[PDB]
Amino acid sequence: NKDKAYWSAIIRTLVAKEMRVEPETIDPDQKFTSYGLDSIVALSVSGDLEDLTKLELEPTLLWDYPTINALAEYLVSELQ
């Protein structure tokens, strides 16, 4: 069941917890930086995703794939 929607829900949860807001308030297609996400948060989120996926994931992936859904798409690709 680990499709794009699965990873999108996980990433949204991680981002919302770091930003201290409810996940429903975050648009998964909006650029991370347009709602204030910074480098400390990018490191937190990518590191947590490493813990969950066993992948090596640089914090700059949140620049390269700059929305929740874009990052989810990347994870699916890496794990397929």
PDB file of C-alpha atoms in Angstrom:
ATOM      1  CA  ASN A   1       0.000   0.000   0.000  1.00  0.00           C
ATOM      2  CA  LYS A   2       3.049   2.291  -0.113  1.00  0.00           C
ATOM      3  CA  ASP A   3       2.046   4.432  -3.061  1.00  0.00           C
ATOM      4  CA  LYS A   4       2.347   8.179  -3.559  1.00  0.00           C
ATOM      5  CA  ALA A   5      -0.622   8.910  -1.277  1.00  0.00           C
ATOM      6  CA  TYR A   6       0.927   6.796   1.502  1.00  0.00           C
ATOM      7  CA  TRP A   7       4.189   8.745   1.461  1.00  0.00           C
ATOM      8  CA  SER A   8       2.384  12.042   0.969  1.00  0.00           C
ATOM      9  CA  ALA A   9       0.402  11.444   4.188  1.00  0.00           C
ATOM     10  CA  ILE A  10       3.604  10.567   6.084  1.00  0.00           C
ATOM     11  CA  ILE A  11       5.511  13.589   4.769  1.00  0.00           C
ATOM     12  CA  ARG A  12       2.584  15.911   5.497  1.00  0.00           C
ATOM     13  CA  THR A  13       2.510  14.607   9.060  1.00  0.00           C
ATOM     14  CA  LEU A  14       6.245  15.173   9.487  1.00  0.00           C
ATOM     15  CA  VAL A  15       6.088  18.678   8.021  1.00  0.00           C
ATOM     16  CA  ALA A  16       3.043  19.690  10.087  1.00  0.00           C
ATOM     17  CA  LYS A  17       4.645  18.429  13.303  1.00  0.00           C
ATOM     18  CA  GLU A  18       7.808  20.434  12.584  1.00  0.00           C
ATOM     19  CA  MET A  19       5.858  23.568  11.636  1.00  0.00           C
ATOM     20  CA  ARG A  20       3.584  23.167  14.703  1.00  0.00           C
ATOM     21  CA  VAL A  21       0.343  23.342  12.701  1.00  0.00           C
ATOM     22  CA  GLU A  22      -2.437  20.879  11.844  1.00  0.00           C
ATOM     23  CA  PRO A  23      -1.693  18.783   8.752  1.00  0.00           C
ATOM     24  CA  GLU A  24      -5.001  19.746   7.116  1.00  0.00           C
ATOM     25  CA  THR A  25      -3.784  23.365   6.975  1.00  0.00           C
ATOM     26  CA  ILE A  26      -0.859  22.416   4.737  1.00  0.00           C
ATOM     27  CA  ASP A  27      -1.307  22.255   0.949  1.00  0.00           C
ATOM     28  CA  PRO A  28       0.671  19.246  -0.332  1.00  0.00           C
ATOM     29  CA  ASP A  29       1.224  21.005  -3.682  1.00  0.00           C
ATOM     30  CA  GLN A  30       2.504  24.286  -2.233  1.00  0.00           C
ATOM     31  CA  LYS A  31       6.262  24.940  -2.121  1.00  0.00           C
ATOM     32  CA  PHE A  32       7.666  24.195   1.349  1.00  0.00           C
ATOM     33  CA  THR A  33       9.298  27.593   1.625  1.00  0.00           C
ATOM     34  CA  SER A  34       6.091  29.473   0.855  1.00  0.00           C
ATOM     35  CA  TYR A  35       4.807  28.338   4.261  1.00  0.00           C
ATOM     36  CA  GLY A  36       8.023  28.999   6.125  1.00  0.00           C
ATOM     37  CA  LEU A  37       9.861  25.685   6.058  1.00  0.00           C
ATOM     38  CA  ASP A  38      13.600  26.200   6.673  1.00  0.00           C
ATOM     39  CA  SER A  39      16.858  24.240   6.585  1.00  0.00           C
ATOM     40  CA  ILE A  40      16.593  22.951  10.156  1.00  0.00           C
ATOM     41  CA  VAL A  41      13.162  21.571   9.306  1.00  0.00           C
ATOM     42  CA  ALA A  42      14.393  20.130   6.003  1.00  0.00           C
ATOM     43  CA  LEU A  43      17.135  18.293   7.903  1.00  0.00           C
ATOM     44  CA  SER A  44      14.588  17.028  10.463  1.00  0.00           C
ATOM     45  CA  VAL A  45      12.159  15.796   7.813  1.00  0.00           C
ATOM     46  CA  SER A  46      14.741  14.158   5.566  1.00  0.00           C
ATOM     47  CA  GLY A  47      16.458  12.532   8.551  1.00  0.00           C
ATOM     48  CA  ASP A  48      13.155  11.177   9.825  1.00  0.00           C
ATOM     49  CA  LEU A  49      12.401   9.824   6.353  1.00  0.00           C
ATOM     50  CA  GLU A  50      15.781   8.053   6.444  1.00  0.00           C
ATOM     51  CA  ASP A  51      14.705   6.434   9.717  1.00  0.00           C
ATOM     52  CA  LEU A  52      11.433   5.285   8.129  1.00  0.00           C
ATOM     53  CA  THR A  53      12.658   4.239   4.639  1.00  0.00           C
ATOM     54  CA  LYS A  54      16.291   3.126   5.134  1.00  0.00           C
ATOM     55  CA  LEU A  55      17.162   5.370   2.181  1.00  0.00           C
ATOM     56  CA  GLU A  56      19.922   7.950   2.213  1.00  0.00           C
ATOM     57  CA  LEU A  57      18.139  11.268   1.722  1.00  0.00           C
ATOM     58  CA  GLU A  58      19.837  14.678   1.556  1.00  0.00           C
ATOM     59  CA  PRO A  59      18.001  17.700   3.003  1.00  0.00           C
ATOM     60  CA  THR A  60      18.395  19.365  -0.411  1.00  0.00           C
ATOM     61  CA  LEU A  61      15.813  16.878  -1.714  1.00  0.00           C
ATOM     62  CA  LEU A  62      13.264  19.341  -0.292  1.00  0.00           C
ATOM     63  CA  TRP A  63      14.728  21.907  -2.701  1.00  0.00           C
ATOM     64  CA  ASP A  64      14.822  19.507  -5.670  1.00  0.00           C
ATOM     65  CA  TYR A  65      11.312  18.197  -4.918  1.00  0.00           C
ATOM     66  CA  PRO A  66       9.872  21.273  -3.276  1.00  0.00           C
ATOM     67  CA  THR A  67       6.387  20.163  -2.211  1.00  0.00           C
ATOM     68  CA  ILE A  68       4.999  17.324  -0.125  1.00  0.00           C
ATOM     69  CA  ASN A  69       3.610  15.597  -3.212  1.00  0.00           C
ATOM     70  CA  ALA A  70       6.803  16.061  -5.264  1.00  0.00           C
ATOM     71  CA  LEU A  71       8.862  14.541  -2.459  1.00  0.00           C
ATOM     72  CA  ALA A  72       6.344  11.684  -2.125  1.00  0.00           C
ATOM     73  CA  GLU A  73       6.678  11.017  -5.855  1.00  0.00           C
ATOM     74  CA  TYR A  74      10.454  10.846  -5.422  1.00  0.00           C
ATOM     75  CA  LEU A  75      10.208   8.345  -2.552  1.00  0.00           C
ATOM     76  CA  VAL A  76       7.962   6.044  -4.569  1.00  0.00           C
ATOM     77  CA  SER A  77      10.463   6.175  -7.434  1.00  0.00           C
ATOM     78  CA  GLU A  78      13.379   5.363  -5.136  1.00  0.00           C
ATOM     79  CA  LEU A  79      11.610   2.452  -3.468  1.00  0.00           C
ATOM     80  CA  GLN A  80      10.165   0.944  -6.654  1.00  0.00           C
TER      81      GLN A  80
END
